[PDB]
Amino acid sequence: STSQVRQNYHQDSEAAINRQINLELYASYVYLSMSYYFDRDDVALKNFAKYFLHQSHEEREHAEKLMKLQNQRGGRIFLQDIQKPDCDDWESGLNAMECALHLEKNVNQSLLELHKLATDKNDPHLCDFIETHYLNEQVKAIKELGDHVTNLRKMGAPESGLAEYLFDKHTLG
Amino acid sequence: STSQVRQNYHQDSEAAINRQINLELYASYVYLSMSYYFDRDDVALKNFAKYFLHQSHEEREHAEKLMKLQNQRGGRIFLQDIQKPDCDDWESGLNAMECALHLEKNVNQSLLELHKLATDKNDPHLCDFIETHYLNEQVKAIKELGDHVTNLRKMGAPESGLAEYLFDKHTLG
Amino acid sequence: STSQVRQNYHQDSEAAINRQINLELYASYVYLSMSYYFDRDDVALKNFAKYFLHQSHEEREHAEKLMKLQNQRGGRIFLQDIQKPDCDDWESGLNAMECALHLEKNVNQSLLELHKLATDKNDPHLCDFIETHYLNEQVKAIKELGDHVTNLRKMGAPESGLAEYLFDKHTLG
Amino acid sequence: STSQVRQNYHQDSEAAINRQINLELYASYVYLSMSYYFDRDDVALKNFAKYFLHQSHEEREHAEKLMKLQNQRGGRIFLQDIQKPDCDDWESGLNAMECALHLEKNVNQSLLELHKLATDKNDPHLCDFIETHYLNEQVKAIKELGDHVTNLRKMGAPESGLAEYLFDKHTLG
Amino acid sequence: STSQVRQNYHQDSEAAINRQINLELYASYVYLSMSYYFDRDDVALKNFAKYFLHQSHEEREHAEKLMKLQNQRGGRIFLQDIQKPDCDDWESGLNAMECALHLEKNVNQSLLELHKLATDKNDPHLCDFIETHYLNEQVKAIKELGDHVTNLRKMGAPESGLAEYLFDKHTLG
Amino acid sequence: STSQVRQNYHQDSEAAINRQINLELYASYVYLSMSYYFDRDDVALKNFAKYFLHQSHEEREHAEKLMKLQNQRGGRIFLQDIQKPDCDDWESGLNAMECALHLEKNVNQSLLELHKLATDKNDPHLCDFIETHYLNEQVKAIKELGDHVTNLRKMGAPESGLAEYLFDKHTLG
Numbered sequence A, B, C, D, E, F: 001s002t003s004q005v006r007q008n009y010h011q012d013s014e015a016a017i018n019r020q021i022n023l024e025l026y027a028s029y030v031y032l033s034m035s036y037y038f039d040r041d042d043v044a045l046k047n048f049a050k051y052f053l054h055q056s057h058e059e060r061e062h063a064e065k066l067m068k069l070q071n072q073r074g075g076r077i078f079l080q081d082i083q084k085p086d087c088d089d090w091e092s093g094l095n096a097m098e099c100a101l102h103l104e105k106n107v108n109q110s111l112l113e114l115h116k117l118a119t120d121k122n123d124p125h126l127c128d129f130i131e132t133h134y135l136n137e138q139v140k141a142i143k144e145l146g147d148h149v150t151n152l153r154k155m156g157a158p159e160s161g162l163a164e165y166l167f168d169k170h171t172l173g
């Protein structure tokens, strides 16, 4: 049953990739939830909605790239349920950005664990894949979200609806 | 707590839309699974893979349009877990097409039930939405899949790997 | 006699690069042999011929990049005889693809050993060079060849000359 | 006081980045000094001047990229004095190229130490940053300078003013 | 040892130009520090960052033009250490603009002293150089910074983070 | 076992073509070695490197054309080991050009022997092939190399590094 392509690809690595696929799909779902919260008539921040929808689609692309990797290496994809997000109502633009920052840091932590595994199993291809495609993307995402949180807080969010309105227009627009 | 926009939108309809969102997301996931099956080194049918990936992305778009509808009408989106697909290994191009046909008919049945609900609740906007955006799309999908199944069977699939190869090239390519 | 440019470049690494140069040149020669087998009047599969000739030229480019590296680091190139390929007659399209897959996996194994050496000698430049220019290229090559082998086998090669003919036209053309 | 973005970023790494910033700024200053030496009326080698000025600007860009990294990771930039270069009068084109080669090797050594630190602290993002943006750039620079030194020496510099003149025109022009 | 080009160029003028070179390089460094303060995740004012980075690069250009002058006149460049800026943390957009205004006025004062020296040494070329390339540039810079400080203060900075946010967007963007 | 295409193609001719293939591949390897000698940091003559690399690629093309001929005529290609070049270090531009001239004359001698064989076996197609594709190419190559050797010697190579430098720039550049 060993794939004809498989070489230097540990079972533990294969399993970790399947976990990471699920995590990326979960993140995609979280961002989708956030997006549509901002589309509510009682929230009505269109550029927040757009921002999170973009992030949702990006996370899905990340998942798909891991699926591609799994097959490239001769591993086998095993999908799991995609858990629903932790919240239905994301409260405010600031709260959503803070939740996104937390999520991104969680995803980054997983990726760092995956890199450590790859290095421990002497799988340089896998380690390089993670470095090249995932780790700087995460650092950039985290920095961007932190910047957003800073600005929102400085402007007076979430108490000031004017703050979120103007941030939506000037930063996210 | 009633939305300022809400008018003529029954709680039962709102609940049915939330169920349909989940079903579309599930369908998207099924098609994603199928796609990546065909990308395996031991399957290696790239145009089958492409076909199913396209379908996956289309189902996600369908889900998002329902989410948009929910907010347009002043309903509230409640997401649920996305169940994993029924299979990890889809066996053959023919078997996957047959499974897709079954799925599409299941989705269509739900949509017909949703239309009946809308009509029973005297919600012409919702009924029209389903007719306009979903019902002909489903009929077309079902007809296309049936055509594919017919052709594959006539060509000798799944016993003939030459059949699937040539169908991949000439129909799906 | 130490080069003015040399820094952090171990003698063992230098020797391993010279071995890898020879291996790449050998691979180039193998693919050249395969190419011209398919150009025989009694074989006559032009797209197989083209495929392997392309691979031959690619392997030569890989060798030359290693030669460039050797000089960049202040090592010294020592060339060795290029051994003739193991076969004169490659039997069939399927057999050649299987032999190519075996070759590519052998080249990949060497590269993985080179990476391990670089990591053991704390030579991050060399390790990065191998990761960046060689390891994903090999994974991709291996996956492609595996896909080709799968398809040929499914279509009925090598017993079916129709299979190889059609694969030549539709996949390799 | 821990930055909201900070993750997997050791204090030792942060300190090493601040040192590297200073070193790059120092290198920039050295090259600036060299440039303007060649602009003297009693030296008058315009393409040497241009070469070194370009290098000065490149080193500044390198410093700025490290500053960007520091902030991306949630470290804090601490600037130090930029020491004056070791010479005011660089003697000859050959002598300046030799001094540049020595400088570049010193910068490379620091970078290799930084990479080793990153690897020791299990900071793959930082290690990858150094590999991707700094290590091949340094190898290339070192090789180029070595080539220049070789050519100048072979041509008869610094005893032959004709050598430097012609090198300025044909190599650096 | 007198340069073949030197004419009407006093030793005191030569020394004053070397001091001005250092001051311009210092100013460049100050602005660089400011720039990267605004790039911090906990500050996050991108257009402030851009503004100061531009100023940094401009001051470097000013230094280089003085170096060119020194050589044009047959003086000799003597570089000194570039002192680190007075602050690591610039507190606020308003505080940085105020510090910039103070710096620019200090640079202007030096330039006025240089002009007076040139006039006292009957060096019309040098006096004209300073007038043509430096004095109106400084007046313009000072006026611009004063305008910025005025606006920030009127808008409610630094107490209002909304003020700095909006100034960043509308004035500096 | 006689090829269906074979006509008027003597076994001795077939064997001679296989020998010529090996010789062309050998020549290609020699030129590759020379190329990379000139790329060394302690040699650093980029246009010599380029010249020889071009020649390497040309010889490979010559080999491939003979392989094509062999199959066109219904002969069978039998590859042999490619011997390593006689030198690792080619000493100087002049020495390499002299070695190239010697090589080209050796290749020409073989080709003349092949032509004589073809004429003796009354194989006008083969004789014409050699005349049309190989003999004038060799005469031109030999004349060019002789011209290069003459110029290098007249300029003072190899004692004058200025000679090789200038030849590299003006003739080979």
Ligand code: NA
Pocket: A024, A027, A058, A059, A062, A107
């Ligand atoms: Na992701």
Ligand code: NA
Pocket: A128, A131, C128, C131, D128, D131
């Ligand atoms: Na890497």
Ligand code: NA
Pocket: B024, B027, B058, B059, B062, B107
């Ligand atoms: Na659907």
Ligand code: NA
Pocket: B128, B131
């Ligand atoms: Na209708």
Ligand code: NA
Pocket: C024, C027, C058, C059, C062, C107
């Ligand atoms: Na290769």
Ligand code: NA
Pocket: D024, D027, D058, D059, D062, D107
């Ligand atoms: Na640098």
Ligand code: NA
Pocket: E024, E027, E058, E059, E062, E107
């Ligand atoms: Na200035």
Ligand code: NA
Pocket: F024, F027, F058, F059, F062, F107
């Ligand atoms: Na030839």
Ligand code: NA
Pocket: F128, F131
């Ligand atoms: Na003729």
